[PDB]
Amino acid sequence: SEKAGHQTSAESWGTGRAVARIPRVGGGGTGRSGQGAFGNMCRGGRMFAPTK
Amino acid sequence: ARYGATSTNPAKSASARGSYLRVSFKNTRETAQAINGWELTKAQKYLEQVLDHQRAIPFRRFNSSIGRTAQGKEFGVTKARWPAKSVKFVQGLLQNAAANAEAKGLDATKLYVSHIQVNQAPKQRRRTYRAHGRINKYESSPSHIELVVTEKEEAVAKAAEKKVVRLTSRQRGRIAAQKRIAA
């Protein structure tokens, strides 16, 4: 499905002392707050070159 | 069930097991190491003395940054303590061990601890607070204790595994010559 791996509002926090540059979903208390998305290296993220 | 190493027949031995007890795992480990290799009643009086706070449990594994005592010389080490909670827990463990030994009705006069086992348990993870609102772990170290007690029997003096001698032809000839000459 085209919409897969898109229902997130993650933004990168920039270069950090001990945090990667992968965008992570904001907010707090969600459980996933601070976990990467939108990428193939993240849990539940989109797949590289989706099978169209 | 599924007891650990029982290097003996259960028909002549007794077993005890305690699981999920909120005790310091490292203290339990050192106490078990101290206890093992002794006799039941001797260990009982020793732990009673420890509770009375005159003798001490030595330190074997986790023995760093501990103040000196005046009575470690008994076992040759300079690190010892009196872990009261683990002491009373192993008191109960050995007490029920002796009780079930009496229940199974084997000779208690010659009962000594054969095997001991102290292992970790799933951690209890609390939630504490630190500077700047940090969240970190508060981990307890629950233990699992297993005791296997045996009655000391008499060792068999029979010597099995007799070797088989193979000798070359020259060696056999030399042996025969020595036999015929040693007269």
């Binding site: 926090w13 707050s33 | 993870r125």
Partner: protein
């Protein structure tokens, strides 16, 4: 009745392991802190004391 009591005693075990205050407490934990894992502590307006 004894069976139900045993079921409840067993069921509370998982929450006890999770160290929750009870069947009602469900306070989750955030993985990372926005105010503790970002920014550059340069001269001037510090991130915090």
């Amino acid at each position: 009745r004894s069976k139900a009591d045993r079921m409840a005693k067993m069921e509370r075990r998982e929450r006890n392991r999770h160290a929750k205050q009870g069947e009602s407490d469900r306070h989750n934990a955030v993985s990372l802190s926005k105010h503790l894992f970002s920014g550059k502590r340069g001269v001037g307006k510090t991130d915090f004391r």
